[PDB]
Amino acid sequence: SNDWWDIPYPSQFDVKSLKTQSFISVKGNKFIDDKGKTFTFRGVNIADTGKLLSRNQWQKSLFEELANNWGVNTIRLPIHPVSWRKLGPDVYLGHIDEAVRWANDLGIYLILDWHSIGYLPTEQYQHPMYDTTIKETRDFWRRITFRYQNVPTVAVYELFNEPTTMGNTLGERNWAEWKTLNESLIDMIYASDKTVIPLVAGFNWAYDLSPIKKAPIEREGIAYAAHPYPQKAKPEVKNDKNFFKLWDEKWGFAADTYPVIATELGWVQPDGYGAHIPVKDDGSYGPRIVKYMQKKGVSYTVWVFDPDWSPTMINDWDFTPSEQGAFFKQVMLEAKK
Template identity: 50%
Template structure:
């Protein structure tokens, strides 16, 4: 038996034995104007952390309650779980759902809400994607959300459903995609989610790897009770940033809840350093201050020593410089 299959089997045994030992119930989140609110009507601003795909964490031996304890210890109130289409297929939906079940229970035990993110990058219309790990299709995407929304319809901890991680045409290399086409595809996904989980809050990203939301100004997605997503890494725009962020995505927060489900930075000498993530504390301080002033929620990428830009140096959870900044901001 292949090593990866052995790891999967052992992990599922642990999950089955662990069952659902924690019952830290969280208040259901809904949309009120441009805010996320709980059942008591209190405004909730999310500040949290991305972890790696549960598939990777199982294979690294790091899929365990300690991870979620550490997230909460850093001050997070939400965790984003990125589900790669390739990993979803490798495990099969039944076994992957067991991983999600476990992660959600561990998150609840620490008082953390959960974003489930269909983590693909590319053009869902042309079925062309940035790398093999992101390969999917509209049919598979709809089937994923049908399955997930039915599974967690009665689970308030699963607060947000990010329908597609990063829509992009890769500067035209992946074909064309208009905002109207994207809006129609998003509505198909939202309708499936809502039919199975009426209280769900879908998250919708814009173009340019989920950075550009300018079409929302004149042509918002025709759905109620949704929120929009931005991924404003430091090199998406040149300094000064704030006036450009406001024009590109920040204006959306005047009328809708807005959550930056990926922010982060790294230095050129760090492992996996790449554009558009090269930056420093000036970026980190500027963007967290901007979000604080506008009431925008955010989730830093990524709580992993290998995936970049890293928030930790090792599995002892030693923070990188970016990790220290975002930890302090939470």
């Protein structure tokens, strides 16, 4: 332990431990499985692994509930940098391994999300739980890509959850700089595993993809994230037509050319639990965003399947559904059928 020269080199996840499972890949503007069928990610976020462990809720039964009773085919894991450091990489990766085995057994997929909020080029963030560096972010993806080489269960590497400069208080937002840094991460990933799908985000908290109309990331096999929460678009008159136009302008257009995953979406009533901008809505957003995504073939993972973090999909750890939880549960179950 004091003999640092005898610390072992890292090992890769044992692919023989898994049951057969299709790889998902990008083909044009769609995801497809390795049988050639169009595939749509449909599922939920759960909380950070460390948060779940802290209350003894990191267990296979959580994934079983979701796969069997909520219609999901995907779970997004929002890996918070502060938690990565607190558990440490070795321990955190040991718990991701569990998630891989649990998901594989149920035939569902994982999105691994490096869950920071802020501006990576200046290393300034919305809150210290998101604090990271370029060096730590690169090392996270280097470790992940090596460990989960050739693992179909781990489908998407979501490089940096929510880019934002908070009105340029964190730095001067610059698309060219952000594009170049994403390309750099993708190059490190693809040097280690070409079968994984990188997921890239725009500014305004992963809401604004409009820069990619003329400056998309110059790499193959990638998809784009979107976080179309209810109050991100602000039409004077609230109806389907006006939201659809604003969504089209900022993010929806991307689905015409590339696959898109709405890796966060959801709402709570303005006087409901943990209500805050931009997630406040009277509920009309639910049918509206689902209709929009269904029309464009957009994939999604609702935020969040947790009783503490808001907007919640459940009210307690017996999985009593919240308003949005009841709504999306029915949507996902119907889509699965």
